[PDB]
Enzyme design. Structure first.
Site, PDB file in Angstrom:
ATOM      1  N   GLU A 238     -17.666  20.255 -18.345  1.00 25.32           N
ATOM      2  CA  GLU A 238     -17.111  21.562 -18.637  1.00 25.32           C
ATOM      3  C   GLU A 238     -18.111  22.547 -19.206  1.00 25.32           C
ATOM      4  O   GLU A 238     -18.844  22.203 -20.122  1.00 25.32           O
ATOM      5  CB  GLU A 238     -15.950  21.394 -19.661  1.00 25.32           C
ATOM      6  CG  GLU A 238     -15.341  22.714 -20.127  1.00 25.32           C
ATOM      7  CD  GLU A 238     -14.113  22.565 -20.994  1.00 25.32           C
ATOM      8  OE1 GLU A 238     -13.351  21.597 -20.785  1.00 25.32           O
ATOM      9  OE2 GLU A 238     -13.909  23.420 -21.885  1.00 25.32           O
ATOM     10  N   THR A 257      -6.387  14.316 -16.790  1.00 23.82           N
ATOM     11  CA  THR A 257      -7.346  13.380 -16.238  1.00 23.82           C
ATOM     12  C   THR A 257      -6.663  12.323 -15.387  1.00 23.82           C
ATOM     13  O   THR A 257      -5.734  11.648 -15.830  1.00 23.82           O
ATOM     14  CB  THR A 257      -8.122  12.685 -17.381  1.00 23.82           C
ATOM     15  OG1 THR A 257      -8.926  13.631 -18.078  1.00 23.82           O
ATOM     16  CG2 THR A 257      -9.006  11.530 -16.888  1.00 23.82           C
ATOM     17  N   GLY A 407      -6.848  13.390 -24.744  1.00 26.35           N
ATOM     18  CA  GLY A 407      -5.928  14.363 -25.306  1.00 26.35           C
ATOM     19  C   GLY A 407      -4.595  13.704 -25.585  1.00 26.35           C
ATOM     20  O   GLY A 407      -3.911  13.242 -24.668  1.00 26.35           O
TER      21      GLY A 407
END
Ligand SMILES: [Cl-]
Length: 435
Positions: A238, A257, A407
């Protein structure tokens, strides 16, 4: 100008990593190799070093250390010192720790004394390798002779890699995820990114590992460095922030993901799931909304736009939802304020970001340092390029390790989150070349 045509059949990533390994070692110097839009920029030797710590700013040049007290924003202190570096050289390179981003959320008192925030240096020499040519900048006779010798032999054969076991959980990642899930269920925050370190029980050859992994990855940026006792490499998935000389600002957040590299049909099923998954869509839209809010603090009114929205971005062992956001830097703002406005990334912290960063202090191994910080390239014409430091390997004081995270949201399950870190670790684990 001062160029060598790229030899036929030679790939730039291989030649740049070979130059980094052999040229720099022959003169015993530090370096940082940064890949940005087809250019592999080797920043060789330290002409001047800026060290920003939580309690001090240091500028080290020609053996003399100048120490400075700093107050307020870390970006203002780093920016003032880096702008001075760029009066003498065209480019500066380095890394920004995750801890650089805690000040904007008023959490800096939680940092221990002498916590590193950033390391940015002006190189003595720059060697830029592309598919078309090798460009030399400020290369002395000794470095030019070293490049000549390397081009006379060509790139080394990459040895077979050595495997690592990532199945163990010595830091209790599964338990830390369950604690975070309970906090989210209680309404403390919506999402937090937690991570785990994986030891590499053998010393690795960083330039050879860099080459091997780079052949099997499609990162937005990549790096290879040896700087102040730290060796590191990574395939950044990123772009945190990019500021161009013409004022254009770019941020490219990722969210969600699924595994990748498991065969065409299996990857297509995972891609279709990722694209149409409600949880992943929600997290990605919320992350785009956060990026737009942040960029508005530094952009010319009405200049912020999403030029690519919620499309699959392939990153070797994993695939994620990604958006490309563009804006114009306001004349009252500057590139460090743009980095501060977009740092830490949502992928490094959580939602709300203040609550996610505070949770990371309690539920993750801190300081994170390089991990989830950025590797940066700055230019005298106002340019800034900052790659999110994930999918990376590190070596500091006899210890070699990998680090990956996930996350965590209300519906997260510790087992699936642990498996997600394994998928992310697979960006590097099949490509470790032993020293
Ligand atoms: Cl990661």
């Amino acid at each position: 100008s001062s160029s060598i045509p790229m030899p036929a059949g030679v790939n730039p990533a291989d030649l740049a990593a070979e130059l980094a390994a052999v040229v720099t070692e022959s003169v015993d110097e530090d370096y940082l190799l940064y890949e940005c839009d087809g250019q592999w920029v080797l920043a060789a030797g330290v002409q001047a070093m800026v060290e920003l710590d939580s309690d001090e700013l240091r500028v080290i040049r020609d053996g003399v250390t100048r120490r400075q007290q700093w107050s307020g924003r870390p970006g203002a202190a780093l920016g003032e010192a880096v702008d001075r570096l760029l009066l003498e050289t065209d480019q500066a390179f380095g890394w920004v720790a995750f801890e650089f981003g805690v000040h904007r959320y008023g959490l800096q008192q939680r940092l221990a004394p002498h916590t590193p925030l950033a390391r940015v240096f002006s190189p003595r020499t720059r060697i830029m390798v592309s598919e078309k040519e090798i460009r030399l900048f400020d290369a002395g006779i000794r470095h030019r002779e070293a490049i000549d010798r390397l081009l006379a032999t060509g790139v080394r054969e990459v040895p077979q890699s050595r495997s690592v076991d990532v199945s163990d959980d010595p830091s209790g990642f599964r338990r830390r995820v369950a604690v975070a899930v309970d906090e989210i269920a209680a309404g403390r925050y919506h999402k937090v990114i937690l991570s785990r370190c994986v030891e590499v029980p053998f010393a690795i050859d960083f330039p050879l590992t860099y080459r091997l992994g780079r052949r099997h990855n499609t990162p937005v940026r990549s790096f290879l460095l040896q700087l102040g006792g730290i060796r590191a490499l990574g395939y950044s998935p990123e772009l945190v922030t990019a500021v161009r000389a013409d004022g254009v600002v770019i941020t490219e957040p990722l969210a969600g993901t699924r595994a990748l590299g498991r065969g065409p049909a299996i990857d297509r099923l995972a891609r279709d799931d990722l694209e149409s998954n409600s949880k992943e869509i929600v997290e990605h839209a919320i992350s785009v909304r956060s990026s737009l809010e942040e960029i508005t603090d530094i952009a010319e009114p009405g200049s912020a736009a999403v030029i690519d929205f919620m499309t699959v971005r392939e990153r070797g062992s994993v695939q994620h939802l990604g958006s490309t956001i563009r804006a114009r830097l306001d004349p009252s703002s500057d590139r460090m304020a743009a980095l501060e406005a977009l740092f830490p990334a949502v992928t490094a912290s959580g939602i709300p970001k203040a609550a996610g960063v505070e949770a990371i202090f309690r539920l993750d191994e801190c300081p994170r340092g390089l991990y989830s910080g950025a590797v940066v390239m700055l230019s005298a014409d106002g340019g800034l390029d900052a790659a999110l430091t994930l999918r990376a390997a590190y070596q500091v004081g006899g210890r070699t390790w990998l680090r990956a995270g996930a996350g965590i949201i209300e519906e997260s399950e510790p087992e699936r989150e642990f498996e997600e870190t394994c998928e992310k670790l697979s960006t590097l684990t099949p490509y470790l070349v032993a020293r």
